[PDB]
């Protein structure tokens, strides 16, 4: 702590990561493979 070591935060918070895994799930469950290749 006296030593000039630091820990920077990630750009995407765990809240934002959980919103992406939610969108990937909701796309997969409602629309199959289609949201990977065009509109859902």
């Amino acid at each position: 702590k006296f030593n000039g070591l630091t820990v920077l935060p990630p750009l995407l918070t765990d809240e934002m990561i959980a919103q992406y895994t939610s969108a990937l799930l909701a796309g997969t469950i409602t629309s199959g493979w289609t949201f990977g290749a065009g509109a859902a």
């Binding site: 630091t6 820990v7 920077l8 935060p9 918070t13």
Partner: peptide, 29 residues
């Protein structure tokens, strides 16, 4: 830390949530 030219000057002081009271002003995570 700083941004560029048209995006003029305005700086970040890179604390681990430790306050801005050491230094518009906006405390940030």
């Amino acid at each position: 830390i700083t941004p560029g030219t048209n995006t003029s000057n305005q700086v970040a002081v890179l604390y681990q949530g430790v306050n801005c009271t050491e230094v518009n002003v906006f405390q940030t995570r």
